[PDB]
Subunit: 289 residues, 3 copies
């Protein structure tokens, strides 16, 4: 460290030299040009050897407050170094984060503006949709208000069709019924014209049957027959269908002749028998009783 | 500071002594040698306090030169930990903000990847919907092509059904007009068959009325009756409808007999009354005038 | 740079003034003490100046070791600011770049938050349109059934009206054809009305024809005119339809002087002439053959 002894003065120098008292008798002048000078030189060398060690201590005691402030330095540096070195790994790490973050920010911002245009695209896409759906519900509303009016007038014309369809058969069975009714009538009229007598024809009409009339038969507007006459007694006798002559019963004379009255009586007999068979006619027919 | 006074030596008067200066007689040999060896030492001891004070000065120059290059290191060491304190407050405020940026950023694409899976799912939910819309029109768009096909038939049918009901209204009016005639026409033909005289029936027919005829009355194909004859004059007298003699005979005598001639005139009378009666009955019927 | 020349001392004489060597009566005690003490001081100044320069040399060699650690003191601190100056360049890069990344992130987080409030309303715009679509899908499924039902209605409505339209027309002929045949009939009917001969007629009838019947004409219920009579022989003679009387024209007296027999003879032959006329009349009419 330091030496304090250095700072301890040796100065003595007990005595200062004078002559007297020294053998100035036994000495040459020159030993006295030495012995007084030797004493002064010895004493000046001491004080100088003393000052040499005062300054040697001051230089030693400075070196000891230098080494103490060297050692305070040596420490303040090492903790300044251990600090920059740790600050180093810490900044090197702080940037390493900033650089691998900005990449997380860039991958974000890039998807967002993509997401931004992948959003308002879907909004546009649903607006087309929305506007369609509403029109589709505008048409379906019109379609429902129509189909039903179609169904309603289909029912309304079906009840007019099934009516006529059943009235058609009514007429069609009225026509075929009247068809049989017409043909038998026209056939009965054809026969009725064949078997009937007309007030209008000359062509002689032949009955297969007897005839009856109320009062008189007639021709030309004159009465030709009447009721069978009454009151008759039937003439009996012999009916003469033989020859009949109108001759004079003659020879009537002035004298009685038997042969003529015999003729007149025989021209009576035979005249009565015509009138008898002329009566046999009017009876057989029935014109008289 | 330091002392420049130490480079200053002290000069000495004492110097090497020849035997001439010394008192050979007075001093012992050993004290003779001591005094000559004195000046050596006395002079050589000087050569140190000289050389010590030099190196004491030379050590105070190298000292004071170090002292300013110490405190130079100190202004540097005090300025260094000063800027290093400006190091440590910054990096730890840099690393506290580094983890605030990692948390924010993680929340960034946490929401992005949600934004990304919704937009993708809504695209899938849109691509399904507009698919359904595309056909939804295709259905509806054809529907009104059918509705206008249906509704048109409806009007086309309602016009064809109407004209059919107008016709049938006319038909049914005239099937009841006809069926009201043929029935009457079957009524008048029914009264005709009861009221007519016929050619076919064998049994006797009859009239409630007087009958007239033209030019003839016939039976069996032969004409039995005909027109009335007008040339007649009325036969007068009394008519005899009573008993008429059957084969009345007369027996005549050769000589005149009154009673025999009386009977012949009487049978002339009666038979003249018989011929008057046939004609009187004939004029009653009207066969003659 | 140390001078070891200050680490070596003086060698001084071993003998110091034993006084065995000192001048006997020559020196006064005044000078006897000085000389003796001057031997003790001189030898003392040496062994100090020896260590007064031993200190300086030790205040030098230490300063040498002081200059070697200062060399390491500067060579460190130079590096200390060499890596520190790089720090505040690399920290101010760390700190200013921290601020550039935030302002991108702050913006980025708020344009997402607007992106999520837009897409949360999309999800419900898609879903509402999702709900109005299948409501249309089912309504259209209901619309398809109803239309097919509607068009199977009119197709079968069409098959009925045509089958009906042709049914009316054939019916439209057969009614006016029936109208004809009835008019033909009912016209021939009224002919039979004004012409045919009645059984029940009251007023006297007429015929433009000769009548002929098969067996018996009758009037009143009894046979009057039947088939003509045969077996007759045509009477030869003349006829008299003139004046006639049934009167008694023949007188008989009791004698024959005169012919009044010719009066009975003339009345028999005017009577046979009526009986001829009465026979003719029945022959002309046809009643007799
Ligand atoms: Ca120093
Ligand atoms: Cl429809
Ligand atoms: Cl940093």
């Amino acid at each position: 460290m330091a030496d304090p002894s250095l700072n301890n003065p040796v100065v003595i120098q007990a005595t200062r030299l004078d002559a007297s008292i020294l053998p100035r008798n036994v000495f040459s002048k020159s030993y006295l040009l030495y012995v007084i000078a030797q004493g002064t030189d010895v004493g000046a060398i001491a004080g100088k050897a003393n000052e040499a060690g005062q300054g040697a201590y001051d230089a030693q005691v400075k070196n000891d407050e230098q080494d103490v402030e060297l050692a305070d330095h040596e420490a303040r540096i090492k903790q300044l170094r251990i600090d920059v070195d740790d600050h180093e790994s810490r900044i090197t790490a702080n940037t390493k984060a900033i650089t691998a973050l900005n990449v997380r920010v860039t991958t974000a911002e890039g998807e967002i503006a993509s997401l931004q245009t992948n959003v308002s695209a879907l909004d546009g896409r649903v607006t087309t949709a929305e506007n369609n759906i509403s029109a589709l519900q505008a048409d379906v509303d019109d379609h429902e208000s129509r189909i039903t009016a179609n169904t309603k007038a289909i029912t309304a014309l079906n009840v007019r069709v099934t009516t006529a369809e059943g009235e058609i058969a009514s007429l069609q069975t009225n026509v075929s019924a009247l068809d049989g009714r017409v043909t038998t009538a026209e056939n009965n009229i054809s026969a009725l014209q064949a078997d009937y007598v007309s007030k209008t024809a000359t062509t002689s009409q032949s009955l297969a049957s007897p005839l009856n009339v109320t009062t008189s038969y007639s021709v030309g507007g004159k009465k030709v027959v009447g009721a069978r006459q009454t009151g008759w007694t039937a003439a009996t006798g012999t009916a003469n269908k033989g020859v009949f002559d109108a001759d004079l019963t003659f020879a009537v004379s002035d004298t009685y002749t038997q042969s003529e009255i015999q003729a007149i009586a025989n021209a009576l007999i035979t005249e009565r028998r015509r009138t008898k068979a002329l009566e046999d006619a009017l009876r057989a027919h029935g014109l008289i009783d």
